[PDB]
Design a protein around this ligand. Structure first.
Ligand SMILES: N=C1NC(=O)/C(=C\c2ccccn2)S1
Ligand SMILES: [Cl-]
Length: 292
């Protein structure tokens, strides 16, 4: 750690404080992450992440385990999608750039999903952009390594906004579909300039999902009524038209979103199949206007 000089506090992540830091004796600028508990098993799983390299995955450069303390050194990105969407509120992100960001993010998912690694916690804070028109996923694989808590070490409530319905219904063996779901939510949010399901508790979150997409049953989601936190007494809401959900997203866009938001994780489109979707037919890579 004496090998690094703290430049500034970026924030408080799930796992602890995040610093922009500078490598005192190689000179590279990095994201320094202090992980708060290290168990042999978290070490082994994090070291696996070091080989999982893709241009749309924020590069894990190193894992320093010193003392009984855990530090992760990442490639530094200067902006996240939450800031970018804020800065972009009066007019919204142009759709060619939403299409690019989605297509790149699906590319990161397809890669990680092929080696069987999930994120499980995708959210605008975890998505990171550069001046090149790139977008990248931060913290991939870390949920499996450390858990996902209700509150950060600083008591910041962890958001549920992007959580998949099978997770909220207490399914314990969720798959890669969880990441598709979250990215769908994020996609709808970039398009409309509003979070899709801004829930402030598990039931509020689940009930916001239900209200937009219908209360799921055995027709749409075989096995649902038998999931741990399913209750027969859930209100039964009818599904809203998507044309009402994401104006002014075009037909290909709404079609794709709809497949990303399938209740049944087995019916939900994969990262791989989504890249072949007609929505990406005229995809381009514009350069954003970033203020740093
Ligand atoms: N280079 C990076 N900058 C960041 O800010 C990174 C990830 C991040 C940072 C804070 C909270 C959640 N994720 S990676
Ligand atoms: Cl920022």
């Amino acid at each position: 750690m004496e090998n690094f000089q703290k430049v500034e506090k970026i924030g408080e992540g799930t796992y602890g404080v995040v610093y922009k830091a500078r490598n005192k004796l190689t000179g590279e600028v990095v994201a320094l992450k202090k992980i708060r508990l290290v168990p042999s098993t978290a070490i082994r799983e994090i070291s696996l992440l070091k080989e999982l390299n893709h241009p749309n995955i924020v590069k894990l450069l190193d894992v320093i385990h010193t003392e009984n303390k855990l530090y992760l050194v990442f490639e530094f990105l200067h902006q996240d999608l939450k800031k970018f969407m804020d800065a972009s509120a009066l007019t919204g992100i142009p759709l060619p750039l939403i299409k690019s960001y989605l297509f790149q993010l699906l590319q990161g998912l397809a890669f990680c999903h092929s080696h069987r690694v999930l994120h499980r916690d995708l959210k605008p804070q975890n998505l990171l952009i550069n001046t090149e028109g790139a977008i990248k996923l931060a913290d991939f694989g870390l949920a499996r390594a450390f858990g996902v808590p209700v509150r950060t070490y600083t008591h910041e409530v962890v958001t549920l906004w992007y959580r998949a319905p099978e997770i909220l219904l207490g399914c314990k063996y969720y798959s890669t579909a969880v990441d598709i779901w979250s990215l769908g939510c994020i996609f709808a949010e970039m398009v409309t300039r509003r979070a899709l399901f801004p829930g402030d508790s598990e039931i509020d979150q689940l009930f916001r999902i239900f209200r937009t997409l219908g209360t799921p049953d055995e027709v749409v989601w075989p096995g649902v009524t038998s999931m741990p936190d399913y209750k027969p007494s859930f209100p039964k809401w009818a599904r809203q038209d998507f044309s009402k959900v994401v104006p002014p997203l075009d037909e290909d866009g709404r079609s794709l979103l709809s497949q990303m938001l399938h209740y049944d994780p087995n019916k939900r489109i994969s990262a791989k199949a989504a890249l072949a979707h007609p929505f990406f037919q005229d995809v381009t890579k514009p350069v954003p206007h970033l203020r740093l």
